[PDB]
Design a protein around this nucleic acid. Structure first.
Lengths: 223, 186, 155, 66, 97, 180, 125
RNA sequence: UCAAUUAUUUUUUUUGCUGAGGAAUUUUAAAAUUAUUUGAAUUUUUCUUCUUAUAAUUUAAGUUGUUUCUAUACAGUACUU
RNA sequence: UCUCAAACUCCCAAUAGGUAAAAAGGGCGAAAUAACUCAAUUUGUAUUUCACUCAUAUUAAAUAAAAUAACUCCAAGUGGGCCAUUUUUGGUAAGCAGAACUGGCGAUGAGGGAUGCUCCUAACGCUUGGAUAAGGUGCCUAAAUAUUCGCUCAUGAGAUCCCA
């Protein structure tokens, strides 16, 4: 018995060492990505030719509005989206069908590109996960990697930083991780809004729809 | 407010536990529940559920039907979650190993005479707790006469359900809509 | 009020312009199999075997073929339930369906790709993936050849 | 005495309560109405195949017993 | 008994919300690389204000040539804006009668 | 920094172009400067103009640049001429106005305030077509001509207000209006 | 409001006395659930006599517990001592309504031998 | 003087509210931190990193400690209700 | 050449609708069976038995508290409804009569709309704390006689959708 337990504990320690090594590669990659954007902009300024960077791949969508009086197509898209509660936030893979679905529920959601600090912070402070059997789930705060290393071990994620990495930039294993985590139930914004029922886009002060980068400040406001 | 399909509830159906106050069957289901939860196999769990079921889901299994099945399984032990009945259309037996919920005495005697084996479920549990090399059997579900009246409305096209007829009488329930000559036909 | 067979078909069963009279023989020669999908699209010249209003432009499986008839299983919504209904239509009204033809072409290209991928011993992903990802990109237009725009004033 | 006439109201919403049910999509279907001559030849073919299978099965079994 | 599986174990009772950011043991549990990251931050912090004060001048002086070029690039972007305003304005005066 | 007199309307230079196609083998790139309260608003106004002028909706194009544009000399007060298209309740009108301010953004905020206050025109119903620095002698507004005099030294003549701490509920004696 | 005593928390002291019982004299104060339409109880208008609710129910560790810290057991015969000795540390004796004084006194003496107080001890003296 | 605004970060001043639980082998294991010990690393270190061995401890692994008071009461005008 | 049409139509939307995205299946092959089939027993058809082999070891486009799915049985209550946005027919119009789509009320508390079954916010076990929404911040009445730029004096001014 003890030798098997010991071997497993050593394997568990090894895995944490492996996760540290993955985390280190991720850490290098984060700085490299930041520097590359800067370099791209500076090269563009020097040269006669102008340049732009790539698509940002994910979009974080926050719900804003109650569940009273919902249009039926909007109810369906909300159900698929998983923004069941009024302060639900969730990560979405940028696609055209996902964008079109997002457009249909738009007056009831704000959304944008979340940034690495926010992604890390949100998963750390407000990350809950679905623990149970398929459709017999339960809502648990994460607090240790071994639980989530179990379910996402088959798909080879095994660690919360790896989850942060995939959520921040959509990679080979996004759908499962995204689905597996419980939808983020956020607080109210700790300094409120200009006016809830008006668009961020409007000349009139408002808040719904695309908030792009600035979604992050709102997320920080309502954490 | 959180929007919830079926108010977040799993509201699946069917028997919670045995409704009978019969001590032997309550004792028996406790045993098979214990075996079902501990044992890896499906077999025990399926037996436990089938033991719980209603009377109409406890049909009799025919001795001839069991015999017909077991001839491809020639040294193996049949278990039956129902009663085994005898057959007066049946000439003789070919020697069988049967576990059943209830035995008619004539069948049991016939099985003993044949040199076969009459197993209770407790005896089966003792001998074969795994269910390895055993064979799960069950009788006809839709044989029953109530079900012979179920399905599509009498006199409605392509229907073949038996009516809940008034009486046996010749003049009754063969006219309107049941023969082309009078009004119409189904 | 009234509800006869062709009720409400004045616009719907009109001819398209420049398409008047009997249509080519070579429409009729078109080959049909059992288990084909087939669209029900009706020229208004031939009046026998004309399907009901709901089945115009609908698609379904051929389940039966006769001398100049084709049986087509079409779905119809009847209040709270969709059910399959046996619409008999003519050679005149059948059009060979095209969703299947995209699947067939897709299968053919995929099969050649599968043969190549197996031959090279390298995995492929068949998937008709997302639209939205854009790489980084360059504009090489001269810096005074770029177009300068401003809002439009009034009448 | 002065009645209201109609409305479609709530019926669609009622339909969506249990959803709109759809075909069971069976691989086999009863074939009473399908093409006489060709289908009775199919019945003869099928009976022929069954007979072919029976001949094969009976001879093989008898050979195995010997 | 041979057939019977050995007894398993249920999940533990509810434990309180030990904070991912501010509870160090939990933070290390979640992120085993964090100690090094904490060290990185501390290393930047360790370097005191005198060295920063010496350094600041050199950094700024080495940026200047680039900064002058970057100003010229932006001044040219402005030249296009100004030219567009002048051409449009002239055009309206030409247009009106 | 400030939040006591602050304007959050800023100016953005935005560049975009048509997506390359078989028809559009070489695109046309379009640039404009736009005054907005945020980048999404700036982009949406840029896109609206791309739609109004060109056939290019957000779907049909790609953004090359959006950047906030920087005040050269914020301590210097400058004469801005601004040209509008605006909508009234019963019609559309063009108008050309003069504002002396530090920067164009202050002027646009002032313009929205003026149009709202004097004409009831909301920000949505106003379109700035060009705001630019112009010579002092070319101003038509008397109130700005008055500033441009050699010697400017009026008496201040306004009420005290202090702040919340020394905003007393009651007082022993009556205040001094003149303040000298 | 809420009434803590040790780790025994009881949520509500005030009994849910019946809707407008003083208004119509015929009404009695024990709860009766309106099947009335527009009753101002079920139609849940604030400021009326509160409905009882399962939510007010006792914690499972307490459930039926007394401030005595012992579950009450009602006693009408001497013989009831024999389980009560083994349970004395968790249960308290209450002497029943009927009990004749000679028998009652004997039970009281027995309760002292069992080292458990009677919660209505002064009765019938 | 060295703004400002983003980015990744690192802290800090007062302070408000909370304490379920109850670990006959998950209050266990590792981590963390401290004092040791061995080999390395690198931005080079009086909170620098890893892993090698040893101990303790808590930031792990859901309040505990100290001092009052009730009271040196026998029902009081306090306390319960 | 001027102006045109519910019951006119060269052309012609948005919205709404249908089929499609592979394993009980599909590929390409062989052998079988017919009383169907052609001149023609492989000439096809269809079926059957044997083969070889198609992604799924992240799922032949997504997304999904997708089995809370099916299906059978037995039964209830109900069949006088009403209101709102938008499209809308009759009628001079109507808090009028009549429709369409969707959401409410009915069957519903709670906060705002000064008040108000329906408007807006939002759907509810019991409690503690937080931060907000709709909405406010002269007093009644909780928070600013806040800041900031305009405009405004009225010998019946004006002042929050529905709303007088």
């Amino acid at each position: 018995a003890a030798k098997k337990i010991k071997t497993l504990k050593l394997i568990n320690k090894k895995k944490r060492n492996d996760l540290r090594q993955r985390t280190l590669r991720y850490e290098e990659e984060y700085e490299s990505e930041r520097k590359k954007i800067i370099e791209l902009k500076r090269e563009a300024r020097k040269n006669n030719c102008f340049y732009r960077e790539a698509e940002k791949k994910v979009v974080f969508v926050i719900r804003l509005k109650g569940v009273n009086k919902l249009p039926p197509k909007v109810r369906s898209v909300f159900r698929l989206l998983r923004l069941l509660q009024v302060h639900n936030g969730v990560f979405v893979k940028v696609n055209k069908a996902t964008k079109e679905m997002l457009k249909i529920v738009e007056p009831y959601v704000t959304y944008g590109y979340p940034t690495l600090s926010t992604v890390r912070k949100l998963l750390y402070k407000r990350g809950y996960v679905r623990v149970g059997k398929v459709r017999r789930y339960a809502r648990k705060k994460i607090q240790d990697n071994a639980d989530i290393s179990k379910h996402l071990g088959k798909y080879n994620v095994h660690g919360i930083e790896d989850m942060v990495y995939q959520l921040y930039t959509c990679g080979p294993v996004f759908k499962k991780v995204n689905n597996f985590l419980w939808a983020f139930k956020l607080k109210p914004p700790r300094k409120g809004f200009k006016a809830k029922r008006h668009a961020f886009n409007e000349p009139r002060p408002g808040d719904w729809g695309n908030r792009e980068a600035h979604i992050n400040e709102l997320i920080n406001r309502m954490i | 407010g959180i929007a919830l399909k079926n108010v977040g509830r799993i509201k699946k159906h069917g028997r919670k536990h045995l409704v009978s106050k019969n001590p032997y069957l309550r004792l028996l289901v406790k045993l098979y529940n214990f075996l079902a939860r501990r044992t890896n196999a499906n077999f025990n769990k399926i037996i436990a559920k089938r033991l719980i079921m209603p009377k109409r889901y406890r049909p009799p299994l025919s001795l001839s039907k069991l015999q017909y099945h077991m001839a491809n399984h020639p040294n193996d032990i049949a278990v039956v979650v129902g009663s085994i009945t005898d057959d007066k259309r049946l000439f003789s037996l070919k020697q069988l190993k049967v576990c059943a919920l209830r035995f008619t005495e004539t069948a049991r005697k016939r099985i003993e005479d044949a040199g076969g084996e009459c197993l209770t479920f407790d005896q089966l549990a003792l001998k074969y707790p795994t269910g390895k090399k055993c064979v799960l059997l069950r009788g006809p579900t839709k044989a029953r006469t109530a079900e012979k009246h179920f399905g599509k409305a009498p006199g409605k096209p392509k229907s073949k359900a038996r009516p809940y007829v008034r009486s046996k009488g010749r003049k009754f329930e063969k006219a309107r809509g049941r023969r082309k000559s009078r009004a119409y036909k189904k | 009020k009234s509800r006869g067979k062709r009720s409400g078909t004045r616009y719907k069963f009109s001819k398209k312009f420049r398409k008047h009279g009997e249509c080519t023989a070579n429409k009729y020669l078109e080959k049909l199999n059992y288990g084909d999908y087939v669209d029900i699209v009706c020229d208004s010249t031939q009046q026998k075997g004309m399907p009901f209003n709901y089945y115009h432009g609908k698609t379904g499986k051929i389940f039966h073929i006769t001398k100049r008839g084709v049986g087509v299983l079409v779905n119809k919504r009847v209040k709270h339930r969709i059910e399959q209904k046996k619409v008999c239509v003519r050679i005149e009204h059948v059009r060979k369906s095209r969703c299947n033809e995209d699947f067939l072409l897709r299968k053919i290209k995929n099969a050649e790709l599968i043969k190549e991928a197996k031959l090279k011993n390298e995995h492929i992903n068949i998937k008709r993936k997302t639209e939205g990802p854009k790489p980084a990109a360059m504009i090489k237009v001269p810096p005074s050849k770029i177009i300068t725009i401003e809002p439009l004033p009034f009448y | 005495a002065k009645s209201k006439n109609h409305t479609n109201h709530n019926q669609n919403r009622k339909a969506h309560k249990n959803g709109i049910k759809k075909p069971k999509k069976h691989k086999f279907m009863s074939r009473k109405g399908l093409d006489p001559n060709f289908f009775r030849n199919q019945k003869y073919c099928l009976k022929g195949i069954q007979k072919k299978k029976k001949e094969l099965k009976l001879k093989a079994k008898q050979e195995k017993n010997n | 008994q041979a057939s019977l599986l050995a007894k398993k174990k249920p999940c533990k009772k509810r434990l309180q919300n030990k904070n991912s950011l501010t509870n160090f043991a939990v933070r290390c549990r979640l992120n085993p690389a964090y100690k090094l990251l904490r060290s990185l931050a501390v290393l930047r912090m360790r370097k005191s204000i005198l060295e920063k004060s010496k350094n600041k001048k050199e950094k700024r002086v080495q940026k200047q040539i680039q900064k002058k070029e970057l100003q010229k690039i932006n001044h040219d972007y402005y030249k296009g804006v100004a030219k567009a305003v002048k051409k449009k304005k002239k055009r309206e005066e030409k247009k009106a009668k | 920094i400030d939040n006591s007199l602050n304007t959050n309307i800023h100016q953005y230079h935005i560049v975009g172009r048509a997506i390359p196609t078989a028809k559009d083998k070489n695109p046309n790139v379009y640039r404009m400067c736009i005054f907005a309260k945020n980048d999404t608003n700036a982009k949406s106004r840029f896109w609206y103009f791309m739609k109004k002028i060109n056939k290019l909706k957000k779907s049909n194009g790609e953004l090359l640049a959006c950047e906030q544009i920087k005040e050269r000399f914020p301590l210097r007060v400058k004469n801005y001429g601004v040209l509008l298209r605006y909508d009234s309740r019963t019609g559309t009108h063009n108008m050309y106005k003069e504002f002396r301010d530090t920067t164009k953004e202050g002027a646009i905020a002032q313009l929205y305030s003026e149009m709202a206050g004097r004409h009831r025109a909301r920000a949505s119903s106003i379109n700035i077509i060009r705001i630019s620095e112009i010579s002092s002698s070319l101003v038509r507004r008397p109130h700005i001509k008055q500033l441009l005099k050699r010697r400017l030294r009026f008496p201040a003549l306004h009420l005290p207000t202090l702040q919340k701490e020394y905003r007393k509920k009651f007082a022993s004696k009556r205040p001094s209006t003149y303040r000298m | 409001a809420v009434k803590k005593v040790g780790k025994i928390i009881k949520k509500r002291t005030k009994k849910f006395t019946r809707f407008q019982s003083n208004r119509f004299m015929r009404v009695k104060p024990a709860w009766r659930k309106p099947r009335g339409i527009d009753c101002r109880v079920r139609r849940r208008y604030k400021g009326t006599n509160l409905m009882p609710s399962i939510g007010y129910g006792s914690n499972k560790k307490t459930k039926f517990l007394l401030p005595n810290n012992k579950y009450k057991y009602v006693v009408k015969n001497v013989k009831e001592m024999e389980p009560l000795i083994m349970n004395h540390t968790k249960y308290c004796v209450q002497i029943a309504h009927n009990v004749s004084s000679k028998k009652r006194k004997q039970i009281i003496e027995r309760a002292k031998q069992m080292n458990v107080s009677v919660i209505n001890a002064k009765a019938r003296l």
